[PDB]
Design a protein around this nucleic acid. Sequence first.
DNA 1: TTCTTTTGATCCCCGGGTACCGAGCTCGAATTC
DNA 2: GAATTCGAGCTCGGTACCCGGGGAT
Lengths: 739, 262
Amino acid sequence: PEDLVIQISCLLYDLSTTALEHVLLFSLGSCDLPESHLNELAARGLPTPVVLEFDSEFEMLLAFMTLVKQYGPEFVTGYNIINFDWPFLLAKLTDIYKVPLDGYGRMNGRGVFRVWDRSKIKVNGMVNIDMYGIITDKIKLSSYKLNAVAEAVLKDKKKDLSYRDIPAYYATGPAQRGVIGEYCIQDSLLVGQLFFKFLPHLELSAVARLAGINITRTIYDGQQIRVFTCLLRLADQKGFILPDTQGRFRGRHVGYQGARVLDPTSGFHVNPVVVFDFASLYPSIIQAHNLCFSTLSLRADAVAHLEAGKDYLEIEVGGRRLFFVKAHVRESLLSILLRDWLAMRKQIRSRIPQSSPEEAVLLDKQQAAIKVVCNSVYGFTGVQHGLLPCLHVAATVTTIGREMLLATREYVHARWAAFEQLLADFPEAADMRYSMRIIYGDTDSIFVLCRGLTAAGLTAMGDKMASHISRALFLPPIKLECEKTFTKLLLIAKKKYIGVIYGGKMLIKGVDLVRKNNCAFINRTSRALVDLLFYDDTVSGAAAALAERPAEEWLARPLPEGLQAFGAVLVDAHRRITDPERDIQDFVLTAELSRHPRAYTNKRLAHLTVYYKLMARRAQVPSIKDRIPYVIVAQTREVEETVARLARKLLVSELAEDPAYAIAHGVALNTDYYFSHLLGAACVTFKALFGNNAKITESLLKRDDVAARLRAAGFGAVGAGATAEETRRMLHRAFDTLA
Amino acid sequence: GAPCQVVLQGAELNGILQASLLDSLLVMGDRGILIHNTIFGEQVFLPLEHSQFSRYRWRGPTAAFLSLVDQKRSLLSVFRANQYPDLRRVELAITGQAPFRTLVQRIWTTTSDGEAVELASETLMKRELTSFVVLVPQGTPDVQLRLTRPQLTKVLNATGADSATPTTFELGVNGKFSVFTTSTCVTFAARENAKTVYGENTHRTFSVVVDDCSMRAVLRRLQVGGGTLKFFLTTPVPSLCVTATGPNAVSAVFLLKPQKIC
DNA sequence: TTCTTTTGATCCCCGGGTACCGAGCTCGAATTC
DNA sequence: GAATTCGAGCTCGGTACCCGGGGAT
C-alpha cells in the first residue's frame, strides 16, 4: 500500500486524423510543468497539458478510470502497458482499493477488464495495443527499452528518468514533480509517435477482417485461431465439419520431419552465386499438390477407382503411403483456401502504385497482413495437440519440399553442366561468359555457384533459368525464382553466411552480427572485419588466396601480405577493450528470459543469475519475454566471496552483474571474457577461410620478448630485416663462429 | 640424383635412430641439419652433421622446414623409438629453386632376401619455409664441464621450483664447482670418484644466476644422460648450454639473467 | 488465490558439463652389456 | 648394480560429444 502511483500521463489522439487532441497528466500532489517543456509542446503544435492534481492515490486512479469510462477510448496503447502499467494499476484498484472493474470497460457492468501474463489483456470494447509487443516483432534490437527503441526507430535521443531518481525528485517541491510529469508525458508522446509510424491497428484489422476473428483475438490469441476460423468458413460452405479432439486435451522433440538443408561447400566464394528459391514454397506445395484433410487417404482403397498419377498423388510420408487425390476430384480445402490468399498476395502489390498516397500506405499494412496467413496454414496441420491437426498433411508438405530441393539440384546439375547446353537454353548467355554447381541449399533456396559467367547479367538470365526449371519440373502454383546474386559469399555453416549482393548490399544471415546476444563492442568490431573481407580489396585477395593452401600450412607459413589490415582491426579492438573509459553500454550482453525461471532445468545461465540478483535487490524484476541485459564483471576476490556467500575460476553465469549496478557500484568488466568472445566471434565467422577449422582460425587470429634479448645478446638477424647479402654474410659469420 | 640429397641407409642410420622434438624446425644446409625446437620457453637444438649421414649433399642456400607435415605428422617421426618397427632407411630429397624448395621423405623397410618395400602410404612432403630466420647459439663457452647421469640428475634436483628462488652455478677456486640454491646445495671437483667432474679451462670462475626455473622440466623431458654443461658469459645476457653425451648431441641453451658476478 | 495457448522444423554456436584417450613422461622394477 | 628397455602407472590437456539455451533460418 505504500508503493503508490504518482503520475499518469494520458494522451488522447484521434485515430483517423492521427491528431493528438488532449494531453492529460494525473498527478498525486502538486505538479508545475517546466516552461521549457510547455514551450516545446506549443512549438510543435501539441495541446497544452491539462495537469490534474490529486491528494490521494485513490482519487488519482479513480479519476483515471473515470476518464477511461466516460471518454471510452476505443484503442488504448502505451509501452509495456500489459506487463507493468495495467497490472500495476489494476492491482492497486482491486487489491488495495477494491474497485470492481467489470463496468469500467464499455459495458456498464459484467464485462471483462482482466490481464493475463504472450501476456494478454482483454478489456471489453477496448483494443489495447501495447507497442512493446508491436515493436519486438518489427525490429531486432538487443534492448527494447523505450529510449533505445526511440533512438532506433524515431531518431529521438530521449532522456530517461530512472525510477531510483523519482523519490529524490518527488520529495522536492512541485517543480521537480513537474519534471517527473514531463518525463511521463514525453514517454507517452514517443509511444504515440511509434504507434503512428507502425499503425498497428490497420494491419491487425486487415488480418482480423480476413480471418473472421475480432481484432483483440487477432492481437492476442495466436496464429491457429486465424487458420481455424478461415478453415471453418470453407468447411461449412463445402459441407464439412471440424471434429474436436483438443476438448479432451492439454527436450528438443519434433513431431515429423522438416526440411532439407544441403551441405555447404563452406568458404569464400568470389565467383557469382545465383540464389534461386521458391516463392511461397509450402503454400504452393499445398496448392499444387492439393493437400488437405479432405483429400488425404491413408488407405489405398478410397482411390481404387481413380487413375494413379492422373487423379491422385501417392507419396511415402514417414514410411506411410499417403494418397492425396487431386483437384477435379475434390479441391483440397487447404488449396482452395490458399488460392484466395496467394491471389491477394501478388494482386495487392501490383495495384499499390495504382493508388493514392494514403491508399498505398493502406495496401502496405494490409498486404503485409495477407503474407502472415500464407505460412500460417503449414503450422496448423503440424501442431500436435493443437486444434484440428493432421501431421500427414504437414509431413507431406515437408516431404515434397525435400524432394523439390533435390529435384532442382539434380536438374541444374544435369542440364546446364556445360556452357553449350546453357547457351542452347539461353542464347543471352553468349555475352556473359565454366561450371554451375549448387554449393548450398536450404528448405527452398539453392545457391548455384556459377563459375565462368559474369555477375553482370546473371540475375537477368537467372530469372529465365528459374522459369525454365519451374516449367520443366514443378506444378503451376509452384515457382522457383532467382532472387539474388552474390558477387562474394562466405558460406560459413549451414544457416550462416555473409555475402554482398550484386553491385550492392551486404546480406548477413545468422552469423551473430544479426543476433541479439552480443554486446555492441563485439558486433562493431566483427562488422569492421567482415567489411574488410568483403569490401576492402587486397583483403579479399588475401582471403581468396588462403584457399590455395590447406589450413594447417598457414600455421607455419606467413599469411598473405594483404590480410595485415584484417588483424589491425583486431589489434585495435584489443587496445579498445582494455582502455579505462570503456563505457559499459558497449559491453552489455542480453538474453531473453523466455520462461519462468523455475521452468528451466539449466539454472546456471547468466541472465538467470542476474534475474535473481535483480529480484534480490528489489530492483525491477524482468518479465518472461523481456531481455535481461548483463555485463560480465571481472573476477575479484570480493565477487568470489559474494558468489560463494550466495552459493577457483568462476563461471560466466556467476560473473553476471547487471549494468545499472555495475556502474552505480563501479564494478569493472571482465576484459578476459570480452576479448576471448571477440576472438570467438571472429573465429566463428572466419573459419570458412581456413577450411572451417575453428581451432586453426583461433590460433591464427590470436597471432618479441625473445628477439629483443637476442638482438641485445649480439645475435644478428638473418632473413627479413636486412638485404639478402647482409643475411648471407651474417650466415657466414655464424657458420665460422660455430665451426 | 635430385640436387640436395640426404641418404641414411642402414648401419649409419642406426646411429641416428639411436640419437617434444616433433613440432620442430629443421634448418638443413651445408655442415648438416639443425633441429631446433622451443620447450617451456627455452631453445633446444640437435645438430646432425653432413658427415653423419650415409650421403649428405647440398646445392643452394640453406633451407628450413617446419617438421609438422600438414600439421599432424612429422619428418622426424620416422626416427622415433618404435613408430615403424621394421624400418631400415630414409632418403630426404629436395627439388626446387631457392625461394621454393620442397623436400620429400621416403621410407624403406627391410625384407627377406635383401630388398626393401617403400611404404608409399606414409612418405612425407614438405615445402621450404619461404621466409624464416632463427637465432642459433654462437661462439664457444667460457668454461665447460662434463657430467654424468647421477651427477646431472642431482644438480637438476638442486635447482629451484618457481620464480621465488634463483639458482647459481658458481665455480670457486681449485675445484669448488657448486650448483646451489638457498635450501639445497651440491658441489663437485673439477679435474683437467663421485663428485669429480672433468672439464677444461676450469680457472674461469663466476657465479651465474637464473631467474627462470624451467630448466628441470626442459632437461627432464629430453631425458639427458649427463653431458656437457657449457657457460657463455661474454654477452650482455649469459646463456648456459647443456649437451647430452648419450646417443644424441641434443643441446639446450638456458638464459642466465644479466646479474653476472664471481 | 491465480491463472486462462498457440504457428512448424532445422541449425550453428556457446556455456557449462562430462567423459574418454592419446600423448607424453617420469618412475619402478623385471631381465641383463 | 648401471644403464637400459619398452611397461606400467600418473596427469593433462585435447577433442568431441552431450547437452540446454539463444536465436537465427
